[PDB]
Amino acid sequence: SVSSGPSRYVLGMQELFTREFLAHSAKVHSVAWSCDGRRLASGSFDKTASVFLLEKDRLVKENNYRGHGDSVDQLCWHPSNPDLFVTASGDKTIRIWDVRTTKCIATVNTKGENINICWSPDGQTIAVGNKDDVVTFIDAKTHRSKAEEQFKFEVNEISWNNDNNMFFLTNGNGCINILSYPELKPVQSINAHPSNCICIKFDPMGKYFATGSADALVSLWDVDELVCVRCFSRLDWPVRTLSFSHDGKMLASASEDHFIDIAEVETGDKLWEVQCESPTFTVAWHPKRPLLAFACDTVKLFGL
Amino acid sequence: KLTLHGLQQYYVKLKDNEKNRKLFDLLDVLEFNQVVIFVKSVQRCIALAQLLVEQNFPAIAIHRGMPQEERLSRYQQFKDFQRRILVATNLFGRGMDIERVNIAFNYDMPEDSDTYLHRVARAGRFGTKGLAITFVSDENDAKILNDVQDRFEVNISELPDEIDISSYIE
Amino acid sequence: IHITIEPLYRRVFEDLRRDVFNMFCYLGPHLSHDPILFAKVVRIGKSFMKEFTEVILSCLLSITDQVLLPSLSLMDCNACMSEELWGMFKYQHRYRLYGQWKNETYNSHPLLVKVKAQTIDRAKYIMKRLTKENVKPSGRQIGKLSHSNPTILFDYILSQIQKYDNLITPVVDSLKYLTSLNYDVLAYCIIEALANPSSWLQSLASFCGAVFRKYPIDLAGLLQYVANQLKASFDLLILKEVVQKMATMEQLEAGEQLKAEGGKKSSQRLKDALLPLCLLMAQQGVIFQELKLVGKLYDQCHDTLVQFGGFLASEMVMAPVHEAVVSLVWDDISPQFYATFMYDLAVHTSYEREVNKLKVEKERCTALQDKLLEEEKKQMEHVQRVLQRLKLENETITKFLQLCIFPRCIFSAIDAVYCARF
């Protein structure tokens, strides 16, 4: 049912289908895409940030921000507030930026531990993880550090449940840890994968939640019951990125084998596969959803 | 002197270009550890190595247009179980002193009974059983096959569709 | 079933339990569409066993017999749900549930035979791909096959190891990514492969030694198996290889029984008169009832293997060594010893040679000096004890001395030589 219509829309949008080849001078680390219309931004190794607008489907350039001292490690658009973003870099500082006035709102010296950054879904606080297990909670409006936690084993990716009550993280044993955010206490730990989990991501629907391990298995779980619904045995290498469609029905995963796989949530089968020259490292969607942005080992749009 | 005692030898009469699909059908049925496949030239060797690697078979090619130290280095890597399949035009004699090789395909016809003896007969220490299959394409392959049957006094019949596992595997 | 078992899952009933057991008996293996109630049955069983009535447990064995088959049918999402099955399982009844996978869980459904044929096909495919260059992309593939169908794949790879001559190290590098619950399945498949009625057995024993020294499998079932075959040969050699896996001047760098016999009814008199000398005299049935344990078992295993080799070259010693297995929570001590784990550690001209070799780093030299000083003090104490024993103390006596000396010589290591000299 949804598979045939998805394949038809895939063929139609692929016939409608850009490629910003080497927009930055160096290795692009991440891309993020929010702001329910079309506003993109990307960060790279060459301490640059780039902000794009998407009109009628050819990419144009809005902004190119400097001021960093090291490579951009993680980029993320704000979900709830009007259009703002926060950049993470290895120059011991985090930078909250303004889109409208094209300036840095706050350059906060945290530590050189700045690796991966995210928001609680209220948009009030920013969580930042590291290599040394110290996760720092900094208020986005107060611009002041609020909390410092330590998992003491391993951390790769942290995330926030949609109720702004549960806080999820991973480790090197394939476990997932679940904490209560107003309690700041470790609530539950699930020993699930044998190898470590790299990337996790929620859905806009709040129904499911996928964890991608290094055993080439994307395990899709339920949010409320916290039970393991299904998995996706389509890849042959550890999964680099995970991303969800805004209808909650499809998902995209990429790994070392150059194969961007778009599978269905409700069915559990692959709907589309596309390949390119280099391993795709990040995949992003947008709420209107005919399109798929992705950046690889260069920002490319794909009509799906 | 090399002997053929304890070996099973068979032949298949088929076309030349259909030997790849038939060989793949044999690779889908016959359980093997390491397989040496004998070809006649360099370009056929490189093309067969390309066909095996692109079909995800781990194979290494040694042809006669190579330096001696590179042949010895690839033979030493083949000793250490780095790739299963060896596409070899020729060897340095001494039988087959690696016990891991069990099934040997003559994709192309050898020169005489002596080259067939150097391709098929083994000089191992503990592994004395093995399987050898020679591809027959024309009448000349059958003539050299009957020549080998006259020289070495062995029975070489048609390759069946069911092969016992304990007859040639120790 | 979701409606009926709301409050028990909201916590984490014998008529209710029997009705739910009848519903799962009438369902069968078709829980492939619903992992949620599968996880709920797992959590209910885990809470019941944490609170832990043999009838409820036998019906739980029956529902595990009925619920392993959905995990067999799921060719997706078994890397994680096997850990819920292990949380259920955390003894010999687990091995009986694994023995249900022989012919009972199979050949009763067409789809399971289809899954069996597909996993034999993919197993043969990936066994035709394993090299030593295949440094774990293939471990991912064999793990993906082993999450869903562990028993068929383990039987197939053990047939490959038995028939194809030491393919062992790519197999263990592939099984690096194997789950927690599949380890006991692999152990039971080892036990079932040992039931086959000699180089293949040596290769299988070396494979068992490598896998057991690599992983926490808690191999008490192998200990029960080797004890049962001692009560009924080469299994003793396999157990000696497993114990070596888990843990002339060089031999001379490393007795009390003869001195006690110098100072039957004489055994009772020595028991009335008077540490490791008890096991040393035990090396010499019910009449005999009147980390050195690993070495004590290893010496008896070496004597039994020497007797087996002398028998094979051309059975009284098998009765004593089984008693050494009978005198042996030993599996919990063996796993702690494997988790904890050379010639200089044992340790006098040999002590001076060891200190000179450690001299030609200061912490090890100080430790060796402390060990040598303690050895000199204990040697002075043993010389004082020997002087006290000397202060304490025809042809038939010489014949009795020869009979006591010959049995200690042929029944032990070269340490009988030093005792004979003394």
Swiss-Prot record, chain A:
GO terms for molecular function: RNA binding. The keyword Transferase does not apply. The keyword RNA-binding applies. GO terms for cellular component: nuclear speck; nucleoplasm; THO complex part of transcription export complex; transcription export complex. Pfam families: Beta-prop_THOC3. CDD domains: WD40. WD repeats lie at residues 23-64, 67-107, 109-148, 150-191, 192-231, 234-273. It comes from the Eukaryota. Keywords: Acetylation, mRNA processing, mRNA splicing, mRNA transport, Nucleus, Repeat, RNA-binding, Transport, WD repeat. One of its GO terms (biological process) is mRNA processing. It is found in: Nucleus; Nucleus speckle. Gene3D superfamilies: YVTN repeat-like/Quinoprotein amine dehydrogenase. Component of the THO subcomplex of the TREX complex which is thought to couple mRNA transcription, processing and nuclear export, and which specifically associates with spliced mRNA and not with unspliced pre-mRNA. Required for efficient export of polyadenylated RNA and spliced mRNA. The THOC1-THOC2-THOC3 core complex alone is sufficient to bind export factor NXF1-NXT1 and promote ATPase activity of DDX39B. Component of the THO subcomplex, which is composed of THOC1, THOC2, THOC3, THOC5, THOC6 and THOC7. The THO subcomplex interacts with DDX39B to form the THO-DDX39B complex which multimerizes into a 28-subunit tetrameric assembly. Component of the transcription/export (TREX) complex at least composed of ALYREF/THOC4, DDX39B, SARNP/CIP29, CHTOP and the THO subcomplex; in the complex interacts with THOC2. TREX seems to have a dynamic structure involving ATP-dependent remodeling. Belongs to the THOC3 family. This is THO complex subunit 3. It comes from Homo sapiens. The lineage of its organism: Eukaryota, Metazoa, Chordata, Craniata, Vertebrata. The gene is THOC3.
Swiss-Prot record, chain B:
Its main location: nucleus. The keyword Iron does not apply. One of its GO terms (cellular component) is transcription export complex. Keywords: Acetylation, ATP-binding, Cytoplasm, Helicase, Hydrolase, Isopeptide bond, mRNA processing, mRNA splicing, mRNA transport, Nucleotide-binding, Nucleus, Phosphoprotein, RNA-binding, Spliceosome, Transport, Ubl conjugation. It is found in: Nucleus; Nucleus speckle; Cytoplasm. GO terms for molecular function: ATP binding; ATP hydrolysis activity; ATP-dependent activity, acting on RNA; ATP-dependent protein binding; identical protein binding; mRNA binding; RNA binding; RNA helicase activity. Residues 6-167 form the Helicase C-terminal domain. Coiled coil: none annotated. GO terms for biological process: mRNA export from nucleus; mRNA splicing, via spliceosome; RNA export from nucleus; RNA splicing; spliceosomal complex assembly. Belongs to the DEAD box helicase family. DECD subfamily. Involved in nuclear export of spliced and unspliced mRNA. Component of the TREX complex which is thought to couple mRNA transcription, processing and nuclear export, and specifically associates with spliced mRNA and not with unspliced pre-mRNA. The TREX complex is recruited to spliced mRNAs by a transcription-independent mechanism, binds to mRNA upstream of the exon-junction complex (EJC) and is recruited in a splicing- and cap-dependent manner to a region near the 5' end of the mRNA where it functions in mRNA export to the cytoplasm via the TAP/NXF1 pathway. The helicase C-terminal domain mediates interaction with ALYREF/THOC4. This is Spliceosome RNA helicase DDX39B. It comes from Homo sapiens (Human). The lineage of its organism: Eukaryota, Metazoa, Chordata, Craniata, Vertebrata.
Swiss-Prot record, chain C:
The chain holds residues 387 to 999 of 1593 of the full protein. Expressed in the hippocampus and the cerebral cortex. Component of the THO subcomplex of the TREX complex which is thought to couple mRNA transcription, processing and nuclear export, and which specifically associates with spliced mRNA and not with unspliced pre-mRNA. Required for efficient export of polyadenylated RNA and spliced mRNA. The THOC1-THOC2-THOC3 core complex alone is sufficient to bind export factor NXF1-NXT1 and promote ATPase activity of DDX39B; in the complex THOC2 is the only component that directly interacts with DDX39B. It is found in: Nucleus; Nucleus speckle; Cytoplasm. Changing Y91C: In MRXSK; likely pathogenic; decreased protein abundance; the mutant protein has a shorter half-life; does not affect nuclear and cytoplasmic localization. Residues 109-246 are annotated as: MIF4G domain. It is linked to Intellectual developmental disorder, X-linked, syndromic, Kumar type: A form of intellectual disability, a disorder characterized by significantly below average general intellectual functioning associated with impairments in adaptive behavior and manifested during the developmental period. Intellectual deficiency is the only primary symptom of non-syndromic X-linked forms, while syndromic forms present with associated physical, neurological and/or psychiatric manifestations. MRXSK patients manifest variable degrees of intellectual disability. Arthrogryposis multiplex congenita 7, X-linked: A form of arthrogryposis multiplex congenita, a developmental condition characterized by multiple joint contractures resulting from reduced or absent fetal movements. AMC7 is an X-linked recessive, severe form with onset in utero. Affected fetuses may also have subcutaneous edema and dysmorphic facial features.
